[PDB]
Amino acid sequence: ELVLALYDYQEKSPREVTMKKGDILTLLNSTNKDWWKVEVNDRQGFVPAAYVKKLD
């Protein structure tokens, strides 16, 4: 349910969100292997699964 951003990522498309290294994001949906939907600063969208780490 929470994930740590391991790298910066800037949205490159409408369904994407931007994040900074060290940001703590709310994990909305990780059914897809490559793209995870998250919430950052009351924005929602996708980031690469590999660029974040679950906390549990």
Numbering used by the authors: 7 to 62
Question: What does the publication say?
Answer:
In addition to the standard model system, i.e. proteins such as hen egg-white lysozyme and proteinase K from Tritirachium album limber, we included phycocyanin from Thermosynechococcus elongatus, human insulin and the SH3 domain of α-spectrin (α-spectrin-SH3) from Gallus gallus.
In this work, we report the first SSX experiments with viscous jets conducted at ALBA beamline BL13-XALOC. Small crystals (15–30 µm) of five soluble proteins (lysozyme, proteinase K, phycocyanin, insulin and α-spectrin-SH3 domain) were suspended in lipidic cubic phase (LCP) and delivered to the X-ray beam with a high-viscosity injector developed at Arizona State University. Complete data sets were collected from all proteins and their high-resolution structures determined. The high quality of the diffraction data collected from all five samples, and the lack of specific radiation damage in the structures obtained in this study, confirm that the current capabilities at the beamline enables atomic resolution determination of protein structures from microcrystals as small as 15 µm using viscous jets at room tem­per­ature.
